[PDB]
Amino acid sequence: TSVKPIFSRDLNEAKRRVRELYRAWYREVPNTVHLMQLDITVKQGRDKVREMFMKNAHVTDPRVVDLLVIKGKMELQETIKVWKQRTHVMRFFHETETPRPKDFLSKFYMGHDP
Amino acid sequence: KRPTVRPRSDVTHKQLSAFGEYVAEILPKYVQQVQVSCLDELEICIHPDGVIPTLTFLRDHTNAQFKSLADLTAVDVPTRQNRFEIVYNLLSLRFNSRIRVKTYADELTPIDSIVSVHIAANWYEREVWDMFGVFFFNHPDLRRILTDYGFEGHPFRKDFPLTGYVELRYDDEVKRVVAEPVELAQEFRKFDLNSPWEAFPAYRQPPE
Amino acid sequence: LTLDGIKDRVLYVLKLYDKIDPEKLSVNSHFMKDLGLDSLDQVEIIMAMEDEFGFEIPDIDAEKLMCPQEIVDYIADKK
Amino acid sequence: ASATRVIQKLRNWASGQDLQAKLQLRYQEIAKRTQPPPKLPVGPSHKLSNNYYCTRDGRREVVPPSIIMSSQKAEKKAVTPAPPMKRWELSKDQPYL
Amino acid sequence: TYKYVNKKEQESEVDMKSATDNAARILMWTELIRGLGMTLSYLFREPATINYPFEKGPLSPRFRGEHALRRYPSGEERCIACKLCEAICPAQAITIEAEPRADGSRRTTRYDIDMTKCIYCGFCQEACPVDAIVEGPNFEFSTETHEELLYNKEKLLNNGDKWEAEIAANIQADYLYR
Amino acid sequence: ASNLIEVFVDGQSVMVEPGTTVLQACEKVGMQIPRFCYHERLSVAGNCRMCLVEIEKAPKVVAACAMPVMKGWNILTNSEKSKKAREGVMEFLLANHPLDCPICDQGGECDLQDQSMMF
Amino acid sequence: LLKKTTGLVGLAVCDTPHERLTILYTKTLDILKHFPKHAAYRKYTEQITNEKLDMVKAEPDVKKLEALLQGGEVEEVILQAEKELSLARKMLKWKPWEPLVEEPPANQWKWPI
Ligand SMILES: CCCCCCCCCCCCCCCCCC(=O)OC[C@H](COP(=O)([O-])OCC[N+](C)(C)C)OC(=O)CCCCCCCCCCCCCCCCC
Numbered sequence: 054t055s056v057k058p059i060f061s062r063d064l065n066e067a068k069r070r071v072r073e074l075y076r077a078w079y080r081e082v083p084n085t086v087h088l089m090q091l092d093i094t095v096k097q098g099r100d101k102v103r104e105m106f107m108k109n110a111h112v113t114d115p116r117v118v119d120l121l122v123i124k125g126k127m128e129l130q131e132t133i134k135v136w137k138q139r140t141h142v143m144r145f146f147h148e149t150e151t152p153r154p155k156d157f158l159s160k161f162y163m164g165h166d167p
Numbered sequence: 168k169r170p171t172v173r174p175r176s177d178v179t180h181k182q183l184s185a186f187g188e189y190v191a192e193i194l195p196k197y198v199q200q201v202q203v204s205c206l207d208e209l210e211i212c213i214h215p216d217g218v219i220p221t222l223t224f225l226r227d228h229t230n231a232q233f234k235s236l237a238d239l240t241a242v243d244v245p246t247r248q249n250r251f252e253i254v255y256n257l258l259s260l261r262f263n264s265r266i267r268v269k270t271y272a273d274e275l276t277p278i279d280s281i282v283s284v285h286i287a288a289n290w291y292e293r294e295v296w297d298m299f300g301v302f303f304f305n306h307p308d309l310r311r312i313l314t315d316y317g318f319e320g321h322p323f324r325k326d327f328p329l330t331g332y333v334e335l336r337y338d339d340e341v342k343r344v345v346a347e348p349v350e351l352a353q354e355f356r357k358f359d360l361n362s363p364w365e366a367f368p369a370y371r372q373p374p375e
Numbered sequence: 376l377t378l379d380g381i382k383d384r385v386l387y388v389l390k391l392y393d394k395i396d397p398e399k400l401s402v403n404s405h406f407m408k409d410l411g412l413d414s415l416d417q418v419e420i421i422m423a424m425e426d427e428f429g430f431e432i433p434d435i436d437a438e439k440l441m442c443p444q445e446i447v448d449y450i451a452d453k454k
Numbered sequence: 455a456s457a458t459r460v461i462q463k464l465r466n467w468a469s470g471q472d473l474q475a476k477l478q479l480r481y482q483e484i485a486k487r488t489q490p491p492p493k494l495p496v497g498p499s500h501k502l503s504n505n506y507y508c509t510r511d512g513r514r515e516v517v518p519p520s521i522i523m524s525s526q527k528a529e530k531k532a533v534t535p536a537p538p539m540k541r542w543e544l545s546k547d548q549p550y551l
Numbered sequence: 552t553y554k555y556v557n558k559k560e561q562e563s564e565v566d567m568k569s570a571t572d573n574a575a576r577i578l579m580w581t582e583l584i585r586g587l588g589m590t591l592s593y594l595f596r597e598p599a600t601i602n603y604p605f606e607k608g609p610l611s612p613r614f615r616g617e618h619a620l621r622r623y624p625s626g627e628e629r630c631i632a633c634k635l636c637e638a639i640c641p642a643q644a645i646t647i648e649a650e651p652r653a654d655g656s657r658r659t660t661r662y663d664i665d666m667t668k669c670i671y672c673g674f675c676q677e678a679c680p681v682d683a684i685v686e687g688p689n690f691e692f693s694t695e696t697h698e699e700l701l702y703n704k705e706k707l708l709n710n711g712d713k714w715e716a717e718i719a720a721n722i723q724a725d726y727l728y729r
Numbered sequence: 730a731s732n733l734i735e736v737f738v739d740g741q742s743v744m745v746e747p748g749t750t751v752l753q754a755c756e757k758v759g760m761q762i763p764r765f766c767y768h769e770r771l772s773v774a775g776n777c778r779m780c781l782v783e784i785e786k787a788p789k790v791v792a793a794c795a796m797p798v799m800k801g802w803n804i805l806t807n808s809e810k811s812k813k814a815r816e817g818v819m820e821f822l823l824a825n826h827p828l829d830c831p832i833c834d835q836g837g838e839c840d841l842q843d844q845s846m847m848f
Numbered sequence: 849l850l851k852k853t854t855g856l857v858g859l860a861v862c863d864t865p866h867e868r869l870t871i872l873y874t875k876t877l878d879i880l881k882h883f884p885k886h887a888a889y890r891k892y893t894e895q896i897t898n899e900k901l902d903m904v905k906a907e908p909d910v911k912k913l914e915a916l917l918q919g920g921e922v923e924e925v926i927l928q929a930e931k932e933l934s935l936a937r938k939m940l941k942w943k944p945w946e947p948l949v950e951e952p953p954a955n956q957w958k959w960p961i
């Protein structure tokens with residue numbers, strides 16, 4: 054139960070790095086929408102950022118949180134310098150995908166997928 | 168004598184064994200295993216803590232002079248606790264030799280980058296991180312190098328599917344190149360091309 | 376230090392924060408135990424302070440700023 | 455090959471080489487497209503005796519690598535991986551361009 | 552051994568004649584004029600251009616073109632549904648389904664080759680034990696729809712019937728090497 | 730070693746029950762003797778002669794499917810005599826076997842094919 | 849005479865190769881005296897440096913000195929001596945004569961799996 058840390062000794066410094074990354078993403082989002090001509094609004098992008106953070110927000114391992122921070126910073130700077138294009142940043146929203154229903158009746162009508 | 172069998176020179180085996188003993192006794196702190204294959208190649212398996220000292224010693228020693236990094240790669244063997252095996256192949260031009268240095272990692276223990284030792288290790292470690300998810304400490308610029316922007320998952324892992332999870336197509340409604348969950352018109356048909364009879368008795372593992 | 380001006384301009388940006396109502400907000404209100412916010416909401420108000428004031432704020436001070444009293448006297452003794 | 459002699463002389467003078475001696479286009483010196491049927495030879499294993507596969511089974515001569523030292527299994531001169539590289543001799547054919 | 556491509560062996564000293572030669576060279580463009588002249592020599596040479604489609608580039612009997620399914624001189628399909636071509640196909644471009652025929656012969660009911668998946672490597676025609684699948688010398692079969700390059704057994708049998716007067720000749724010419 | 734006898738497969742010692750055959754001792758060690766007529770749920774026939782192995786200090790190769798180990802026997806399984814015996818028996822089978830592999834249902838399921846390539 | 853060019857791009861020619869070589873080898877030996885006596889790196893590097901220093905002190909001709917050293921040209925030998933000195937300083941910092949830091953798991957170097 055004794056492991057080697059990556060950057061954070063415990064979960065508090067991991068949360069510190071998470072807060073810094075969230076602040077930087079929140080600062081970037083209006084500049085991204087202005088720079089690459091996105092159909093979304095500024096509020097919707099920040100809601101998308103927060104939904105990503107809430108999707109990742111169930112972990113407690115400091116190494117996992119540090120690696121998630123590192124991946125977030127890579128995607129962040131990949132958005133800072135214009136490499137992740139309009140299609141790449143619009144892949145987070147899945148506008149052309151029909152969302153799979155979660156209830157048993159529609160999952161029964163659709164097919165055999167559990 | 169035999170035209171279908173490779174001729175094997177034992178002098179290379181002796182020289183590589185001597186150099187393996189040499190390196191192993193210079194660096195007992197990091198070296199965990201030394202072996203020479205029947206193909207006459209030297210493999211030195213070291214602790215991840217001694218990657219930078221081992222690479223620096225092999226680069227700057229008078230009797231090693233391994234000044235050229237042939238390649239840096241990773242092998243995913245997902246049955247070990249540390250599933251990634253990082254392999255550094257090095258070429259010595261002064262002594263006209265080749266060495267291989269092996270170390271281990273898993274998804275949550277990064278190892279030190281050797282960009283300070285070899286500058287090719289920059290792009291090679293970027294590729295290793297992109298394909299296997301092995302983080303490298305003190306890399307000047309560590310990011311993806313081969314996959315698409317926003318690609319999720321590391322595709323050279325054994326548990327990553329061959330066709331992947333998403334595929335790209337042009338949607339005229341949004342006028343974009345959108346990524347959708349993957350559907351194949353013809354599924355990749357895997358083949359069970361393993362003979363149930365033992366081929367090589369020299370590698371017969373003992374029963375469990 | 377224009378303490379009254381910085382105080383009611385802090386309360387002004389809390390009024391224009393969307394997630395909290397204008398009703399139960401008070402000067403002595405607490406973000407999580409009373410207003411029912413989250414940590415990322417808390418840093419949303421902190422960065423609202425940052426980009427509405429024009430001076431940078433560290434996360435160490437941001438973790439401390441939890442109620443408007445420590446916010447207003449922090450900007451008072453920082454300005 | 456069908457060029458006139460005046461054009462050939464003009465080409466040779468303009469290029470500085472004898473172009474007619476080494477033509478870029480193949481005319482008649484190539485082999486015929488219809489060739490006589492071949493008869494390929496056989497290898498050394500094509501014999502009816504003294505040819506047991508276990509005496510020439512090179513695939514089963516591969517052995518696992520020998521462990522010099524291991525963390526679980528395991529006055530002398532300093533050595534090198536190999537004797538040092540001899541210097542390349544300069545070419546006696548054309549050493550400089 | 553080795554040789555030098557840019558090092559000058561010793562030196563040609565500093566002569567006034569060499570100075571005048573260099574001055575003439577970079578004042579009157581001598582290397583430029585000789586490049587002009589040899590380009591003019593290529594103008595006065597004969598072009599290497601063939602008159603397609605009335606003239607065709609040379610090929611070999613080994614050429615790997617369009618796939619075809621062959622027949623015996625009796626007329627029966629050579630294929631016996633043995634599926635080595637599908638097993639060896641490196642692009643997985645072959646799909647074979649089979650059942651015993653009405654006379655009990657082992658034949659294919661589905662033999663599909665995806666030409667958009669195929670890599671034109673001849674592994675199928677060198678793995679075929681009865682010389683059924685071949686890669687005949689047709690290459691001018693570009694279509695306008697992606698579907699038309701998804702060949703089935705009827706298309707491959709039609710190709711084998713069309714090109715048999717040439718495929719058999721090529722196999723006769725080159726079968727002694729393989 | 731209560732009601733057990735010591736034998737050797739390639740020099741590796743193993744306890745076996747009395748009445749254990751050479752094939753059974755070899756698979757207890759973890760090596761599979763080639764076979765065509767032996768089936769572990771059928772009676773012992775011993776006709777195909779594919780399981781011929783060399784015992785140390787013994788001139789004649791024995792059938793591993795039928796011969797029971799006696800005591801201290803060193804079963805040389807990858808020896809020159811065993812490989813020669815397997816090659817000869819495979820040659821005798823494939824001498825009269827018909828060239829029917831493409832039109833045969835034993836595509837990759839053929840013991841004759843697999844043991845041909847292996848021995 | 850004196851070498852015109854060393855043939856390698858970026859490598860300057862050394863006007864006085866013997867003095868530079870002997871001070872580099874003396875400095876390497878001096879920094880090797882700080883190692884533990886049982887250090888195999890210290891023993892082997894002292895052997896290599898001692899033999900090379902004896903060859904420099906024995907031969908005053910650059911060409912036959914290069915032929916005796918067998919390390920390419922004498923500029924390459926000087927650069928290798930610099931690299932060896934910096935390496936010895938780093939090895940003294942690192943202390944790898946200590947025992948193995950951690951044994952790997954039992955199946956870490958077992959192939960095939
Ligand atoms: C009008 C009819 C047609 C005429 C031209 C016919 C076509 C020729 C086409 C040739 C190919 C040209 C392709 C483009 C080339 C571009 C590069 C180029 O030209 O570079 C120029 C080059 C440049 O050289 P450079 O680029 O190598 O640079 C030289 C400097 N170094 C090498 C150190 C970098 O040459 C010149 O600039 C020289 C121009 C001609 C000067 C001639 C002087 C003659 C003497 C003068 C009179 C002296 C006596 C006075 C009277 C005395 C009386 C007593």
Ligand code: SF4
Pocket residue numbers: 636639640641642643644645664668669670671672673674675676686
């Ligand atoms: S030529 Fe190669 S890729 Fe094409 S069908 Fe034959 S085996 Fe498959």
Ligand code: SF4
Pocket residue numbers: 629630631632633634635636637647675678679680681682683684831
């Ligand atoms: S390899 Fe030849 S005979 Fe076998 S299934 Fe393919 S085309 Fe038919």
Ligand code: FES
Pocket residue numbers: 763764765766767774775776777778779780781792793794795
């Ligand atoms: S397996 Fe047939 S003789 Fe033993």
